[PDB]
Amino acid sequence: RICDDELILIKNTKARTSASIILRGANDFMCDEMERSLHDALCVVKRVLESKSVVPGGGAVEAALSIYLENYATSMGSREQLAIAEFARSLLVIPNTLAVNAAQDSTDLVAKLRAFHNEAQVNPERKNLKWIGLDLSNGKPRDNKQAGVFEP
Amino acid sequence: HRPVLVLSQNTKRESGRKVQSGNINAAKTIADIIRTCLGPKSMMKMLLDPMGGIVMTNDGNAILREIQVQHPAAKSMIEISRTQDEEVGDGTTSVIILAGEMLSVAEHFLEQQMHPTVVISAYRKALDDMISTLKKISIPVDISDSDMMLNIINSSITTKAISRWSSLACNIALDAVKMVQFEENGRKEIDIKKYARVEKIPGGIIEDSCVLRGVMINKDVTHPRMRRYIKNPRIVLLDSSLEYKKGESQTDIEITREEDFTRILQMEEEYIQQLCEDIIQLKPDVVITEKGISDLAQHYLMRANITAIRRVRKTDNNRIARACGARIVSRPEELREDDVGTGAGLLEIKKIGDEYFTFITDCKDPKACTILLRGASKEILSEVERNLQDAMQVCRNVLLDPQLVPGGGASEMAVAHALTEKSKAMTGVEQWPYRAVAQALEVIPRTLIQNCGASTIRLLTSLRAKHTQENCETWGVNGETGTLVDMKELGIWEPLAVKLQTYKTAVETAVLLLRIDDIVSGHKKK
Amino acid sequence: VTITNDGATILKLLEVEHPAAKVLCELADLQDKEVGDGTTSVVIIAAELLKNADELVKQKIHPTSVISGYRLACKEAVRYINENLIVNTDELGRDCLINAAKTSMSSKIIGINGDFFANMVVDAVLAIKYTDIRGQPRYPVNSVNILKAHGRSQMESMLISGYALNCVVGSQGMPKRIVNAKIACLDFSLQKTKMKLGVQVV
Amino acid sequence: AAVKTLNPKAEVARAQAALAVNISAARGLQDVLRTNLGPKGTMKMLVSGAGDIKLTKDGNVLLHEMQIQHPTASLIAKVATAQDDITGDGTTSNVLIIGELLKQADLYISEGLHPRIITEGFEAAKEKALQFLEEVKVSREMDRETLIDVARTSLRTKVHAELADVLTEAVVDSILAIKKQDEPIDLFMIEIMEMKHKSETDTSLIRGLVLDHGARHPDMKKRVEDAYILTCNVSLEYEKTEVNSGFFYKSAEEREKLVKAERKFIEDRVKKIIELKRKVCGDSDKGFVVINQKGIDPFSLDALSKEGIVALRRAKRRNMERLTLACGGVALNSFDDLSPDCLGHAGLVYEYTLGEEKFTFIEKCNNPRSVTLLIKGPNKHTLTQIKDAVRDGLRAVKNAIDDGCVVPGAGAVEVAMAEALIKHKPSVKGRAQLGVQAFADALLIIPKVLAQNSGFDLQETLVKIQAEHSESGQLVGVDLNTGEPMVAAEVGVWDNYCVKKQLLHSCTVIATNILLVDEIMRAGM
Amino acid sequence: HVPKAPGFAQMLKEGAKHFSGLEEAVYRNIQACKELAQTTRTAYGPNGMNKMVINHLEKLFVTNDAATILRELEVQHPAAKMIVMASHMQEQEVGDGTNFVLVFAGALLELAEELLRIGLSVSEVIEGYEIACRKAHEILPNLVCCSAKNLRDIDEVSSLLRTSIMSKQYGNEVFLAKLIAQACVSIFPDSGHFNVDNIRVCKILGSGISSSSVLHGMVFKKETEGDVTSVKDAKIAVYSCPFDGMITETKGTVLIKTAEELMNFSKGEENLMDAQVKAIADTGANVVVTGGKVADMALHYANKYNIMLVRLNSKWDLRRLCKTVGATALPRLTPPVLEEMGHCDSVYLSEVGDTQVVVFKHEKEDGAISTIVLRGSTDNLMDDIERAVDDGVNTFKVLTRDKRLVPGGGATEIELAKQITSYGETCPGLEQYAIKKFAEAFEAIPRALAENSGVKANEVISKLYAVHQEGNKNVGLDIEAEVPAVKDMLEAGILDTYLGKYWAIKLATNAAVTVLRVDQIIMAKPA
Numbered sequence A: 001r002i003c004d005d006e007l008i009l010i011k012n013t014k015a016r017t018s019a020s021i022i023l024r025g026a027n028d029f030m031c032d033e034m035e036r037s038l039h040d041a042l043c044v045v046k047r048v049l050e051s052k053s054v055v056p057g058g059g060a061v062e063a064a065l066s067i068y069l070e071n072y073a074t075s076m077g078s079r080e081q082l083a084i085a086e087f088a089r090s091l092l093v094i095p096n097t098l099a100v101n102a103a104q105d106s107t108d109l110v111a112k113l114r115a116f117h118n119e120a121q122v123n124p125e126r127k128n129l130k131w132i133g134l135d136l137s138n139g140k141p142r143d144n145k146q147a148g149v150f151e152p
Numbered sequence B: 001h002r003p004v005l006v007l008s009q010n011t012k013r014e015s016g017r018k019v020q021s022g023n024i025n026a027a028k029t030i031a032d033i034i035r036t037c038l039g040p041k042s043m044m045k046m047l048l049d050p051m052g053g054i055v056m057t058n059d060g061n062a063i064l065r066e067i068q069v070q071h072p073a074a075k076s077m078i079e080i081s082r083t084q085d086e087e088v089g090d091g092t093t094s095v096i097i098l099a100g101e102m103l104s105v106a107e108h109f110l111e112q113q114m115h116p117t118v119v120i121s122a123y124r125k126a127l128d129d130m131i132s133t134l135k136k137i138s139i140p141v142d143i144s145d146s147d148m149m150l151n152i153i154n155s156s157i158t159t160k161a162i163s164r165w166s167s168l169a170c171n172i173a174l175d176a177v178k179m180v181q182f183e184e185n186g187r188k189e190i191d192i193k194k195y196a197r198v199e200k201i202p203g204g205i206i207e208d209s210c211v212l213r214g215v216m217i218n219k220d221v222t223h224p225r226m227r228r229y230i231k232n233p234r235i236v237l238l239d240s241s242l243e244y245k246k247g248e249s250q251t252d253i254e255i256t257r258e259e260d261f262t263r264i265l266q267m268e269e270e271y272i273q274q275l276c277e278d279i280i281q282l283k284p285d286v287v288i289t290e291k292g293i294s295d296l297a298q299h300y301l302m303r304a305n306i307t308a309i310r311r312v313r314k315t316d317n318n319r320i321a322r323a324c325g326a327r328i329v330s331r332p333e334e335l336r337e338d339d340v341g342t343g344a345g346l347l348e349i350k351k352i353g354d355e356y357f358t359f360i361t362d363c364k365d366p367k368a369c370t371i372l373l374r375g376a377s378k379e380i381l382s383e384v385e386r387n388l389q390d391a392m393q394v395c396r397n398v399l400l401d402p403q404l405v406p407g408g409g410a411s412e413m414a415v416a417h418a419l420t421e422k423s424k425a426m427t428g429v430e431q432w433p434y435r436a437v438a439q440a441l442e443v444i445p446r447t448l449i450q451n452c453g454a455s456t457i458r459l460l461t462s463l464r465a466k467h468t469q470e471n472c473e474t475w476g477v478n479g480e481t482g483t484l485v486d487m488k489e490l491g492i493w494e495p496l497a498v499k500l501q502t503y504k505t506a507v508e509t510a511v512l513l514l515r516i517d518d519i520v521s522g523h524k525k526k
Numbered sequence C: 001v002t003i004t005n006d007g008a009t010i011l012k013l014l015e016v017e018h019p020a021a022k023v024l025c026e027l028a029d030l031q032d033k034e035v036g037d038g039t040t041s042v043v044i045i046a047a048e049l050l051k052n053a054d055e056l057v058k059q060k061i062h063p064t065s066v067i068s069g070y071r072l073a074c075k076e077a078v079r080y081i082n083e084n085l086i087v088n089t090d091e092l093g094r095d096c097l098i099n100a101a102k103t104s105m106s107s108k109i110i111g112i113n114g115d116f117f118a119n120m121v122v123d124a125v126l127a128i129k130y131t132d133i134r135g136q137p138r139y140p141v142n143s144v145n146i147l148k149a150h151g152r153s154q155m156e157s158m159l160i161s162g163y164a165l166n167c168v169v170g171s172q173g174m175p176k177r178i179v180n181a182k183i184a185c186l187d188f189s190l191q192k193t194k195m196k197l198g199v200q201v202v
Numbered sequence D: 001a002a003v004k005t006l007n008p009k010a011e012v013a014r015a016q017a018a019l020a021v022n023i024s025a026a027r028g029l030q031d032v033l034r035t036n037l038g039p040k041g042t043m044k045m046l047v048s049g050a051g052d053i054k055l056t057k058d059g060n061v062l063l064h065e066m067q068i069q070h071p072t073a074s075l076i077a078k079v080a081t082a083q084d085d086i087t088g089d090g091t092t093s094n095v096l097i098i099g100e101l102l103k104q105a106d107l108y109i110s111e112g113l114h115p116r117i118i119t120e121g122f123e124a125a126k127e128k129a130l131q132f133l134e135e136v137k138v139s140r141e142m143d144r145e146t147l148i149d150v151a152r153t154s155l156r157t158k159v160h161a162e163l164a165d166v167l168t169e170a171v172v173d174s175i176l177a178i179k180k181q182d183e184p185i186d187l188f189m190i191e192i193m194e195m196k197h198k199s200e201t202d203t204s205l206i207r208g209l210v211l212d213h214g215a216r217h218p219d220m221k222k223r224v225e226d227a228y229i230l231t232c233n234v235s236l237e238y239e240k241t242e243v244n245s246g247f248f249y250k251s252a253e254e255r256e257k258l259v260k261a262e263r264k265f266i267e268d269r270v271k272k273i274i275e276l277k278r279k280v281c282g283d284s285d286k287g288f289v290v291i292n293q294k295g296i297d298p299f300s301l302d303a304l305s306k307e308g309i310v311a312l313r314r315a316k317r318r319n320m321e322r323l324t325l326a327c328g329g330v331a332l333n334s335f336d337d338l339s340p341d342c343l344g345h346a347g348l349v350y351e352y353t354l355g356e357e358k359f360t361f362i363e364k365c366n367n368p369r370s371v372t373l374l375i376k377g378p379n380k381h382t383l384t385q386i387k388d389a390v391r392d393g394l395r396a397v398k399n400a401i402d403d404g405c406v407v408p409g410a411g412a413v414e415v416a417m418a419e420a421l422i423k424h425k426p427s428v429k430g431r432a433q434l435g436v437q438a439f440a441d442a443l444l445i446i447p448k449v450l451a452q453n454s455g456f457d458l459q460e461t462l463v464k465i466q467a468e469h470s471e472s473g474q475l476v477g478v479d480l481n482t483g484e485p486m487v488a489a490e491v492g493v494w495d496n497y498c499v500k501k502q503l504l505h506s507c508t509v510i511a512t513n514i515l516l517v518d519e520i521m522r523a524g525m
Numbered sequence E: 001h002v003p004k005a006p007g008f009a010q011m012l013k014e015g016a017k018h019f020s021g022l023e024e025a026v027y028r029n030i031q032a033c034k035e036l037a038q039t040t041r042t043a044y045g046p047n048g049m050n051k052m053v054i055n056h057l058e059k060l061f062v063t064n065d066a067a068t069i070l071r072e073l074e075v076q077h078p079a080a081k082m083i084v085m086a087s088h089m090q091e092q093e094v095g096d097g098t099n100f101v102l103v104f105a106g107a108l109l110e111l112a113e114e115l116l117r118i119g120l121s122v123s124e125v126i127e128g129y130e131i132a133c134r135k136a137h138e139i140l141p142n143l144v145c146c147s148a149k150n151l152r153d154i155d156e157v158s159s160l161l162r163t164s165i166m167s168k169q170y171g172n173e174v175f176l177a178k179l180i181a182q183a184c185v186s187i188f189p190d191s192g193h194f195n196v197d198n199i200r201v202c203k204i205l206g207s208g209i210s211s212s213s214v215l216h217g218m219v220f221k222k223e224t225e226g227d228v229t230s231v232k233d234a235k236i237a238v239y240s241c242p243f244d245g246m247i248t249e250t251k252g253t254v255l256i257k258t259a260e261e262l263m264n265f266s267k268g269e270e271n272l273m274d275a276q277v278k279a280i281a282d283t284g285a286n287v288v289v290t291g292g293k294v295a296d297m298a299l300h301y302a303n304k305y306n307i308m309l310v311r312l313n314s315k316w317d318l319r320r321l322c323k324t325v326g327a328t329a330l331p332r333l334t335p336p337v338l339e340e341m342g343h344c345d346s347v348y349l350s351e352v353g354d355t356q357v358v359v360f361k362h363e364k365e366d367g368a369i370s371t372i373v374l375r376g377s378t379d380n381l382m383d384d385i386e387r388a389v390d391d392g393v394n395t396f397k398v399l400t401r402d403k404r405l406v407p408g409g410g411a412t413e414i415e416l417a418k419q420i421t422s423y424g425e426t427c428p429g430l431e432q433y434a435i436k437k438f439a440e441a442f443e444a445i446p447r448a449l450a451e452n453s454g455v456k457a458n459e460v461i462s463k464l465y466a467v468h469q470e471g472n473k474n475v476g477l478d479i480e481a482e483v484p485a486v487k488d489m490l491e492a493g494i495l496d497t498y499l500g501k502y503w504a505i506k507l508a509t510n511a512a513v514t515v516l517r518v519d520q521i522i523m524a525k526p527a
């Protein structure tokens, strides 16, 4: 019984042991949202199991690329260095949008975010600050390695 | 005429505080419509249909389905009451008032520069603590007792319009579920919509309404020579026709001789007599099919003393197959002794108001029954039909989950003190929205005194003081008089599946409508 | 009414007219097939790539230097992200699959503090491990039948180990529960024998 | 209002507003329908959009054929539909109780009280009114002179008392010769035919059947005495096979052989009929009538006319049920077991033409158990007066036979029931004391309307009637000729028990539900 | 500034009207039926005038009979339809006296307004009219002076049919009485049921009314398709099937498999049709009348064996031909006819009025059916005489049912006005005023006869009561000239339809009572 409809279930199928998920929500608007959110969650674990490599989420990748590309534009940059320098500022909009939607400090939290990523590239003392992200529930840079914020 | 260089033509854009605080006022508007339809002192609400009909009811589900709204957040609240109507029976009006009150206290925290994800994360922590409180204050029910099950269904129909005929409607709704409780394989099921048909006939009195031990249909006999009163008939259910129809091919017969045309007209009569000889080998009395019966088939069943019914519906054939224990066959030459509906009781073709009705009643152990409703007109008989559907589904929840929650305000106050004592160990920014969920549950004892005209200050101060002690914990609001009576003495008890579905749907309605900060309207689709 | 927050479902239903607007709307549709969750972040980056390049071409800088300058920065960003990863799926084990699942659900309606929806996704992908030739452990996520029903809360979402067919029995005289069943999968209409067009009954 | 915010094109009515809508509309239907209660009521001419005259004063035909668009008037019309569906009369008195149950309750609800307090007094008054109705009913063992006075009461209130003396002999004598030995009388056995022959005061009771179709062959006999009824359901006309076959022939000489052979299966059905006429000793007149529900081709009509067999065609569905009981034969669906046992008998079968429209008459049966009231009204609208009064009178005598007791007449029930609620008014012991008073005053509209339509005073009549009831034990009532209180059980004015029982039940529930309505609104667009 | 009056208690109509009371419903139904009484008052009597009435189909109806006037007038008043349908029932019952219903019931409702506005209400006018109506049916058997019983021949019924003719055809009262006498008496069933359907009127455009005659048989308006138009033997074989062969009913398909079946199929069809036409030529037939179509091969052998073909496309005209020659319509193709043949005297063709007709003229055995061939200058004149002819046929059916007659022309209504007034003076009650007004409704019926003759009706109605001094009972009106000096009606021969007078008083009284019962009118929105 699936709340005034009929639904047929097959248990474990004796050959391959497949899986199916039946979602339960309040109305039909939540069930269409729960289906799209579950399908995007199935695509995350698919790419991790296929390509065994994960990056830290929460703006940790965009903070490290915002400072490495500024040093990359100074080495081999003669006339196209202004486009590489604006490529780093365009990548900073992903941690900038996390501070706007959280109603936190904007020009100080991202400035504190790239302060740890700058010391992880110019001070080779094994600082291990490559996984510094954002804690949007608190408003401070956190370590995404121990917090469990992983993206493919 | 040059076109204007625009983007996203003929659509609207709206964000900010006008959408967060705009969906709250749309939820408060629907909760004020059915606010006078919760207590036992409620009143009916006459509605008008676009077909020309009139729906005069006080049930919270039937009111919101007749309202066409244009607001997008108002369309979400109508689908909430449709979900509560299909899961449980009497779980409708309580969710719309509770979801409007949980969003009423949620609008206060949105003005305090608090993020909506903080209120939802406090709502999900509060939802997990409301389920554990109802399971501690529950009570096991003896489902084998008849007088114990009558007090549960009487508590659900005291709000409705059948509370005046409470001694009759409780015995009808209890016997309807216990007849259709069928179990063939190792799986218990109760189907009170496909097998418990509620038919209404205009005329007579409401006190003469009773649940028949069997089925009934509005069908006359095919021939007047057939019997209209059989003591113990052997009913054979058919699915195919007893006529001669064209095959599923391109058949064409070339007639060159003189004796060929008269032979085909004789082979059409011998084909009908062959399938009529195959159904009389088991010696039946009543032949019931879904398609037409030709007059050549009526002649062979007339001299064999067989009463034939012509055009019984497919849903009525599935209902009589459970009452008489017959098998709906679709081949007259493949009939067996197990396909004969033995054990059927008295069959009588009565007439109720210049129209014949085929009664198949007095069965030994029927697995499907038909509630015969007789009243003044079709207007009030649609009310009793909608109330018996809310009376049979609340008996289905007890037979699948025999636990009772003390209703009438005692359920909401027992959890609101449990959320208050558990909020002392929070010590965070989610402590204050956690307290508002316990204050949002106060709207259910608020409604029981606003409908009867009692005071909401002198009563709620005394009702909140009754739940300060852990011993009693079951004091509710008596909607009949207006004082505070314990629910162990009144007998108002609601099932566990009603109160769990009420709290799970009212929180998740506030979860969906608080994450909405933008609305786009004006685009088309396929 | 469609309540959603995914970058692909919003831009597909939204009507656009500008030719530069259809590029960003079709950019979100490609992220579902290639990756599947990466479909709000691509639209904000690709629009800010045009906002900063507009400030360069207003300084009388030629756009071909901005195009060639973006290719030197895009190929270096893939080079830097492939040499600064932490670890593969051997050290973390099952903790990598749960923590990567909760990051995707945080932007949606199933972002609870618990691990109820996170454990059901990992147990679903790990049960459909379909091997291929040359050592390819494929995980076809389209084989998971995701069904919807307006019922209880989100904590009552069943994880059916098997398959959940969305159909009815039909005739109400069949046993609706069969233990130790033998499934006969077949595709032909079980109706009366109708002759074809070339065959007639004369 | 809240409904105006969600839907701007949705009207609404509030708590004190929706009560004034339902009560003022109930007074609108009360003031119109009170001019036709009883024998002194006035006729109402109802003209539709086409222009036809519907002259009647029954309460069910008045509410349906009235150009009114109101939600309150649609609720009372549905209760009035079931009153004329299962028991006939009691439709005009149904609306007047609802018109007074809402008007007498408005005197208390507007004066501070709650509408639910009045509805609690209606249930306590309905319990005493149901027990008092069982004490005033008179069992008279269903005498045939008692059923005349029952049918005379229901027929006077629909005709000008010159046809009531004629229709009572056509209703009582029709309902007695249908079923015996405690059997439910089926009203489908009485056929109602509309003619135009003589006059409105010429409606007779045919002991057999009157068929509205005649012989379809000019050589058939128009008047047949001592006939044999052969009720058939076969199709004597030419029918083809179900499979599309057609014919194929080579020469023109083989063309005429196929036309002779294609009618062989048709003529085999006709040869079974003409051989049955030779096996019933046809050395006399020995008339034969075949009613034959299905159609007959003119080839078989020419064959049956040469033997002397009258053959009708295209009969009704219930003509194989009424004539089967009247003739005593067996309605056959085939000609494989033809025998003289399935044949009927009638002493006279004749036809008559009224403006190129024949009418077949079958009379002189032994025990028919199926009759036909032959209404011969002059005008088209006068046929609707008699037909709506015959079915009002047939359902009145059908309830008096099924129920074992008879209820008294005009004011012998309603005045005595209202006086019983006054002495039981302090028995409720609560706030519902005024609810029994509103129910007792609402039952007094039946002597008030009958005293108003007759031209007498309204308040001066009700004083003298209640004085003769309080100072005696006889159930006194209203006299529509002198105005003096006269007993209804002695003058021959009776009523049905099921009408007065449903008037206390259908009107009370529909009044307690209307008073508990406070949110009349129109949404759904 | 200016206020208005809204609805009060039951104004719930969506565009409909409502009438209640004596002034809004009862008095307006009287004034509407009063205009229909004044409409047909001019066309009443022998000196009545015609009325050119144009209906919705833009065709002309000119007549003086009030029955066909109301069928073309699209009356929309509901109570006015009650006096129209009451006059239509007079046409269906006896066929004469439809103008009497509009005058008598129009005077009953006119004098009813003089009683409701002076005194007692409709509860005593209805009971007062029904008392005088029952007494009016008791004087009518006492006013019968002659009977249509002795010598039922063409000489005596010519004078008895003059009253129904002269009321619509005043100048042609003598010639139309002889044409209706040679047709009605010739179709007599020898003391049986007289059928009015056995008299047909064939309208032939041409000369005046002096060339009209009655032919013993039937006259059609079709052709022959042959050359056998001169038939003197007249042995008629009637068929209802189409005279073209015998085809099947299901599909019909010729199947050829070899060359012998294709070449012999055309010659085999001609030999099959030749044996069927010659089968009726051996039986002695001369005229073959069919109902359906006729093939070309059927016309080839009809002219070869010299038999005449008659095409009758109408099926009701085919049944009347079987009652003319005494034949039986055969549904099958041509058999050897044993005894179901027809027998006439002369079947020929003639062009009369530039219209080729087929005449089945019976010379010796004249009485089987009759057809009155009318000749007129216009097509509208032939319709008015046909209405006067059909009133003469319906008068002959009245004399078959009841042979009694009452002296008409005003002599009956004055004696009815005198006896009812004697019942009104001896009535000790308040309902005597409606009885005296019932007798004054009979006074207005010879008043309409004097106003159409140009005579002052006050001096006419004064001489009628002066000569009715308890023993005369027969003096009517002499409307042949001014200064009347009115004479007897039995001597002049003005007496017709006692049974017509019996139903006309009963139907007009029940029509006026039915209007007075209407106290409240609820109409709908017309479309």
Ligand SMILES: Nc1ncnc2c1ncn2[C@@H]1O[C@H](COP(=O)(O)OP(=O)(O)O)[C@@H](O)[C@H]1O
Binding pocket: B037, B038, B039, B040, B060, B061, B084, B089, B090, B091, B092, B093, B094, B095, B155, B156, B158, B159, B390, B407, B408, B409, B448, B476, B477, B478, B479, B480, B492
């Ligand atoms: N006698 C009573 N005393 C106090 N409360 C009552 C009584 N009867 C019913 N109630 C309350 O009225 C409420 C009616 O809820 P209802 O609208 O029927 O819910 P649903 O819409 O789900 O059916 C119940 O929650 C119950 O607590």
Ligand SMILES: Nc1ncnc2c1ncn2[C@@H]1O[C@H](COP(=O)(O)OP(=O)(O)O)[C@@H](O)[C@H]1O
Binding pocket: A040, A057, A058, A059, A098, A133, A134, A135, A136, A149, C006, C007, C031, C036, C037, C038, C039, C040, C041, C042, C102, C103, C104, C106, C107
């Ligand atoms: N716990 C967390 N802490 C910080 N950032 C997070 C957390 N969870 C998710 N995010 C961020 O939210 C973003 C959501 O992106 P999303 O809209 O899902 O992209 P797409 O539209 O491609 O699926 C991610 O880029 C991620 O960096």
Ligand SMILES: Nc1ncnc2c1ncn2[C@@H]1O[C@H](COP(=O)(O)OP(=O)(O)O)[C@@H](O)[C@H]1O
Binding pocket: D036, D037, D038, D039, D058, D059, D089, D090, D091, D092, D093, D094, D153, D154, D155, D156, D157, D158, D409, D410, D411, D446, D450, D478, D479, D480, D493, D495
């Ligand atoms: N001859 C009579 N004398 C007195 N009262 C009568 C007489 N006939 C009928 N009545 C009264 O008229 C009332 C209405 O009768 P009727 O019109 O037939 O039923 P309804 O009004 O329900 O259509 C009845 O309640 C009855 O008491």
Ligand SMILES: Nc1ncnc2c1ncn2[C@@H]1O[C@H](COP(=O)(O)OP(=O)(O)O)[C@@H](O)[C@H]1O
Binding pocket: E043, E044, E045, E046, E066, E096, E097, E098, E099, E100, E101, E163, E166, E167, E408, E409, E410, E449, E476, E477, E478, E479, E494, E504
């Ligand atoms: N020769 C005559 N002299 C005087 N009056 C005549 C003569 N012939 C006819 N009438 C009068 O003319 C009237 C014609 O009435 P008519 O219109 O035929 O009535 P209906 O319409 O019922 O047929 C008769 O009432 C009769 O009195």
Ligand SMILES: [Mg+2]
Binding pocket: B090, B156, B157, B159, B160, B390
């Ligand atoms: Mg309830």
Ligand SMILES: [Mg+2]
Binding pocket: E096, E097, E163, E164, E165, E167, E168, E391
């Ligand atoms: Mg005349």
